[PDB]
Amino acid sequence: YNGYLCIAVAAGAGTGYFLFSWKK
Incomplete structure (x- = not known):
């Protein structure tokens, strides 16, 4: 159930x- 793409x-x-x- 939705486990890929942008994962x-x-x-x-x-x-x-x-x-x-979030580079310092």
């Missing part, structure tokens, strides 16, 4: 904490 990248991006996503 791998998301989880992959936000795998750790935030990363560049």
Whole structure:
């Protein structure tokens, strides 16, 4: 049930904490 698309990248991006996503 909806387990892909913007999931791998998301989880992959936000795998750790935030990363560049919320670059300091």
